């Protein structure tokens, strides 16, 4: 089944990509925020933290936009399935090449 597998595989790879986002530096000198705080003092390490925050925000907003697109597609498919349930199953549909 492709229609039942893509909706799960795409979600799994999106979650995996979200996990992979925190392994990137976004141009900084470290990925985890704790290492910079431990090795550099917070007054000078503020720009590094801020660029990490804006990179993580960009990644999360990209994930949110992709999830909204997937939600719209699944809602369209669910409306189609509901119409099919109401017509093809819950009665006999005169629409040829639909059931």
């Amino acid at each position: 089944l492709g229609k039942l597998q893509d909706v799960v595989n795409q979600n799994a790879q999106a979650l995996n990509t979200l996990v992979k986002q925190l392994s990137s530096n976004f141009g900084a000198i470290s990925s985890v925020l704790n290492d910079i705080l431990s090795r550099l003092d917070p007054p000078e390490a503020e720009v590094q933290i801020d660029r990490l925050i804006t990179g993580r925000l960009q990644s999360l907003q990209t994930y949110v936009t992709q999830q909204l697109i997937r939600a719209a597609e699944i809602r369209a498919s669910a409306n189609l399935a509901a119409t099919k349930m109401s017509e093809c199953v819950l009665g006999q549909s005169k629409r040829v090449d639909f059931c």
């Binding site: 089944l1 039942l4 597998q5 799960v8």
Partner: peptide
């Protein structure tokens, strides 16, 4: 009248309320 519906109707032999076809359907997709 001759229509065998045991494939789509649930079977009481298993604790799950599933038909054999939807048993195979759940086992097919991860």
């Amino acid at each position: 009248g001759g229509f065998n519906f045991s494939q789509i109707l649930p079977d009481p032999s298993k604790p799950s309320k599933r038909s054999p076809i939807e048993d195979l359907l759940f086992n097919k997709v991860t």
